[PDB]
Amino acid sequence: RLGGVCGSVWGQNDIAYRCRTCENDPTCAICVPCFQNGDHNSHDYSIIYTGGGCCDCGDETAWKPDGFCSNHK
Amino acid sequence: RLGGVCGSVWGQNDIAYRCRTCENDPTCAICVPCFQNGDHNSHDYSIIYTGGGCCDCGDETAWKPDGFCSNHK
Ligand SMILES: [Zn+2]
Ligand SMILES: [Zn+2]
Ligand SMILES: [Zn+2]
Ligand SMILES: [Zn+2]
Ligand SMILES: [Zn+2]
Ligand SMILES: [Zn+2]
Structure with missing residues (x-):
């Protein structure tokens, strides 16, 4: 859509995804x-x-743009 | 907050949570x-x-209200 960082926050035990293809670094x-x-x-x-x-x-400083979702580009 | 079903949709291989304590049934x-x-x-x-x-x-017809998140009660 026509046009933002997600910034959603995790607690200690919350799951997320690592993507080694898209990440800027392992963190x-x-x-x-x-x-x-x-x-x-x-x-x-x-x-x-x-x-x-x-x-x-x-x-873009933490994640490769081709790895952005449809809501954050 | 002051006051909705989530209704967010999964694709075939998308993960989600089952909660056997909160579910209305196993589906x-x-x-x-x-x-x-x-x-x-x-x-x-x-x-x-x-x-x-x-x-x-x-x-409430699919999930016990005490298992609702903060955005859907
Ligand atoms: Zn996000
Ligand atoms: Zn990726
Ligand atoms: Zn996104
Ligand atoms: Zn939901
Ligand atoms: Zn539960
Ligand atoms: Zn919810």
Whole structure:
């Protein structure tokens, strides 16, 4: 749609996705909804327990733009 | 907050949560964000691959109200 960082926040035991294909570094992650609304077919992703943090979807300094979901580009 | 069913939709391989403590029946489920914004401490929950469907959070006919998240009550 016509045009934002997600920034959604995790608590200590909340799950999220690591995507090693899309991450800027190994400390980056995206929330489940952002994962599900993007294209990670064939990517090396895993479900992780975050230990807290915030979603990097839409932040080009933490996540590769081709890994953004449909709501954060 | 002052006051809705979530209704968020899953694709075939999308994950969600089953909560056997909160479900109306074994076919009910809630989305990850709704799980994370509710209280399922001590509940018998699991991450599942949905096969598609929609989130039951906020629908008293599919999910026990004490299992609703903060955005759907
Ligand atoms: Zn996100
Ligand atoms: Zn996103
Ligand atoms: Zn990816
Ligand atoms: Zn939901
Ligand atoms: Zn909810
Ligand atoms: Zn529950």
